[PDB]
């Protein structure tokens, strides 16, 4: 039943389609020897080391007029930077120019720009899941005769649960195939291991002591992943986490009164285990699932809007729990099960071109728990 | 009453039977010199140190075509890895291939959809148990004369308590016998001692500082056992813990106010002791009961579903607390006593097929408390 | 003014001599593992290692243990490897029980296996043992206590003395508890680096490597729980329900778990309005009802068990007489006396004072150093 | 992102907004042989480090033989070490000015204008507009396949995008005009003059782990808020505009300063509600997430209760006026909207906006 | 405006206020061969680290063969370790003094006295005035454009400013009459005699990061508060007046000491109302922001329940009295406000006030 998690847009035919709100997808004069900068303006300089900077003047200062040697010029600029005379910003300076130029050169013309979205569609097959039931008469006969049980019906209900669990696994698995590698690039700590959050590694845990602090550090990496999702998808920051039992046990220990075992269950001695759902209030940024089938130890930060076209992944059921019945006359032993067909969708990002591309999701390997 | 964690059903006739819902029960091309990786694709390489890792490309980078020296290749791969160009993931690869291959050329066979269960039944006798009061007239005369007591009325309450305790012991005993050795196989720490958790052993306690962290390390092993139960049963994570008083007190010392001492009785100066129930729920997940008769010191993790038929162990009280009364003329001392006939059951897993074999339970010996 | 025996049985007398009752409890060839043995999962074999005697090993893996290991040293080596591999698992008494039940259960019979309730239940005779005190005071104070303070003199002395005799009998009970208590932190309750009967806060072993007092104090509690368990096991009645401990120990215990003891904040706020320090401090961890031994001689605590039944204490006191007055004067100086006598009788669960000293299963005493 | 600025809406371009624009002593030298008077202040230029004022705590003669300035400095240094002379700067500069005014005070007629100029600006109701630009087949399929409202939904998206762009623009002007923060008056001498680097021991003041480090940024924020208070003459920063990284950091401290929200915390896909403020940091700064942050930064700004006390203005005239049509090159549908509002700024003398806006301080952030 | 001072409001200039102005051991040596007497206190000079005062708990003979001061020190030290001899310094001086004073007590004729003289100061109702200078066009536009009462609202600003300016002036005088804080009795030996540098281990008592460094300032504040009690004879500092930076520092320490008036922040600057105390530092000192702080600093001061125990007096005579007219030279309207109040301090003797007033101690701040 792990479909609330994504868009569904159920099909009424295989191939068969879903929709997604796919996104559309520094010129400063000079900072130079003998030039007096003007306060509030910005000048550009290439340092002999580490490329260029863009510095805003706070001080109207003439910089080393005799510095025909960049080494001297660099030194004076550094002194002026220390002085606060000249201050470095990078992309933000690009912005100031863009705003400066468009403001001063603004005109009516007819510059209707576009919503930042391509908006697109996919044709998907109603991919199915199932294998043969094979159950006996005698069993069914005694379940009813002994306890008044509905026999086959109960067995069927169990089976139906197993179907949903297998689907849930597939949905999650697809997230974890299409998801981009998290804790990478824009989301790395300079001293990191490039993709693994190692609780025993001071860098990943930002120098944390005690489980309290290192656990918060994990959530911090999660916040970073959510931001990258916003940066690449344009739909806002990551809105959910799917994670291994180890990860949730850790995150559950952050903010304390957040993740639940649905302990009313245990209180009553396993009254309804509901092992298909989530349980809680971690932070306030991510909806969350406890992946009981996690192969080892990881988390993935995802996103989902209120609109079904704003998932980045889709579950579009065509056939669900459609009963299959029969028997083999050689012994008349019965067949009871269900057929299903649902198919998946994945925002294009242009399965081979989905693997490692899905900007709505970032997958991180977890170590050290 | 141990009968919170077993199936009951029960029997209105010995021989006689119970039901049990029994279970039916990394290939990448290469990461090598001169190969330009493709973003999202996964490449494999065995390092001269560490061994094989699998890295997922984030960057379309040629891995040093001149790195014909495996040492040089390791250096280049490591460099690209540090760069975040190639990121290490472990289980992620195992699952990625499985879907890639199945998706690409999958099929359906003749999938009259199933549940991964055989579901079966076991015939049981109403195995008896019985106790005798074994008391004298002289005692009875004075309990009445001295305290105004109803003599064997009290002995009866004690005796009844004693027989139900013995029954409860038998349930626990069979769980402990049926349990597979825990902290074994899939649940071992490489430096571990095979089936025993030793609080003085830095491996078992994961380098823990003082009792606080060490006690939590025990909790950690318990969760690992609970998972193994889910893996083998196909039903779910352990729902209860049976453990020695030492272990329960240990578990009670971490994960806050879970296990209760029935503090109202302590406050009132032993108005009762009520030492006959589950102490509480560990992690909000496992009901934990005290093994009042533990042979050594230990814990057992077990699973119990909502269905009585999903216990792994069964108890069927056809006859219980039937009083006996009389005298024996040789000493003419009174006769008072109790008898019961309940029988036990196991999930057959084909007693001979459950001792040290039953998937529903895992048992670990505990040292060092 | 309190008995401080609210953790023990009374069974009061109607005559000296005099008696109490107590619910005294009544009180398989695993086949040798050998070279070439093909084990079977769940089966248990006996193995004698050249070092440290025997173990019992359960198969987790259906494996042959080196048929060429005719040398016990080789057999041990293969076994150790199989243990490292998780193939073979060591448990001792925990196995003895499974073999016993399988064998006894399978080969059982209706016959006549009626087992007894696990209780003997017996009685003791107690004389109304007496204790007594005198005021030993002077008349000149009685005269001026009245003239100067408006005091009732003798009346206050009487109250003081009555208090003292009650405190002294309560002290006597504690001494008997400590006398009879078994030594705690002993046998079943020892760790490998332990010191047999004493918890030392300056000893890294006792504090289990604790960081500062918070953790060290908790370590003391952990030892207390272990004591409670051993008591439970030996008496067959369950975990210790109360603690008697010295001022230093109690203050330590009250420094953890936030509110186990009453601080007597009403009393303190009002500047010692009525101290009544003859009362239980409160409940440790919500588990043990704890009383302060205001007369502790060394520094210590005793953990003990008490059921709801007066016959389930392990120690008994049967008040026959209390505060019977004395009045007179000593002609050697004609100074006055006031006084009291009590009579009560005490008992101890038989546990067979000869069978009491260091033998009383309901209690475990541990000394504490380093506070 | 207009509830953090004055609005003063237009009913005509040009058009204008109003703002509460603010209007905008020889201590005797200490010398050799001079005995100080306790509590008195003297001027002294050290050969090394220049001038300080020296306050006497001790009535001490400063080495009558100290002809050489080097000797005079040495005796002063010794007297300083001894606590006899205390080295101070501007607190005294004000003390003497007030002392002197007291001394030379006179009834006269010293009426002084409250320190305000109070002024106005003429503004153009600058327009903005976006179009749907979409294929008809898409719209036909959206409806035909799932009963979606097709072009109607695109219209809703577009209206949203326009509003987001307007907020974007307001932020961009704030970050155009904002002064450079973590500079001047708000620097630690060992700092990088404008960038807060979480990997840099100085910026984080040697903080132990993230908790303390995150607070260190909030401390820098308070320093910025103060500089704003000082320069505007109206009060400390009241709000923050920041990148998600910065907001997430600040939201990680002080338990509940940001919206805990706990309704979108463990479960699945109900909403994202991405149209609101993150909360109030420290109970002081209303904070909004810059969904278009280019790299990683934040700005601290002041906003008073009056329309005239924002330092920046947004004056809506026209909103979401629809466009409908098609592009004949392929006859594909067009929908869209146009708005008009216009902006303003405290004059501060966009010529006088760039890097001059006293109501705001912009800080570049890295290392998160 | 200030109102944490004595007010004793005047009904005339000159005109006066009152103030409750302040008036302002032969231990036996411990020695070789001497058996001590329990409870007695002996003095001993160790060859190293000066002297101690040791009280006998044990009647022990201190090594009669210790004729060598080095041996004597060793035995004394050992008996001290033994608990035989217990060390206290001034506490012993007090105990022996009491013994001596009690023992030799006599009526004689030293009737003692409250250690006060109590005095009076005549003060003028010093005036202050501000102008409006509002133009006609401004008024026409504020009414025409926003429906504003123009001059009336600008007047509210003007009146507020004269109130604030006086409040500022009162504080300024406190900051000059105050004695140098972090001086003498309140210094760390390695200090700079009056400035607290949050980056300097000496001032921050070895503290790690801003958290503990900031806490170290609280320590210095408590030291100042004590010095005030020591010299005033009336009590320890009760309040802190400090720069925004310092108040923010204090706010960050122990958290609940001061508040943002976060309801105003929450409501988007409904008001700022920052004319009241931020809170109470540590639950001990009421703390308020000097929004006009010149550099960066804090002053610790004492205030008794009696107006005459303030150390500073403000005795308002005239306040916020409006000016009305016009000026035909440009024919613009005339508005403004005036006050009269008068101030003074208790010097415990600005000529006799600067750097002298025991009620207050002022410290410079660096390194935040």
Short description:
Chain A is α+β, with helices and mostly antiparallel strands. Chain A has helices at residues 70-82, 91-104, 137-147, 152-178, 210-233, 245-251, 264-267, and strands at 17-20, 42-46, 52-57, 86-88, 113-114, 120-123, 179-181, 196-198, 240-244, 287-291, 298-302, 313-315, 319-328, 333-341, 344-346, 358-367.
Explained architecture:
- The structure is cut from a larger assembly and holds 5 copies of chain A.
- Chain A has 369 residues and is of the alpha+beta class.
- The first copy, chain A, is 27% helix and 22% strand.
- Chain A has helices at 70-82, 91-104, 137-147, 152-178, 210-233, 245-251, 264-267, and strands at 17-20, 42-46, 52-57, 86-88, 113-114, 120-123, 179-181, 196-198, 240-244, 287-291, 298-302, 313-315, 319-328, 333-341, 344-346, 358-367.
- In chain A, a hairpin with a 4-residue loop joins strand 13 and strand 14.
- The longest helix of chain A has 27 residues, at 152-178.
- At the A-D interface, helix 2, strand 5, helix 5 and strand 10 of A face strand 7, helix 3, helix 4, helix 5 and helix 6 of D.
- It is classed as virus.
- Keywords: virus assembly, capsid expansion, capsid length control, prolate virus structure, virus decoration proteins, capsid stabilization, virus.
* Main beta sheet strand tally, sense and closure of chain A: 6 strands, mixed
Give the amount of beta strand of chain A, in percent.
15-25%
Termini of chain A, distance in Å?
Answer: 29 Å
Helix content of chain A: 25-40%
Secondary-structure element pattern of chain A, one letter each: EEEHEHEEHHEEHEHHEEEEEEE
Structural class of chain A: alpha+beta
Oligomer: part of a larger assembly
Number of strands of chain A: 16
**Rg estimate of chain A, integer Å:** 29 Å
Number of H/I helices of chain A: 7
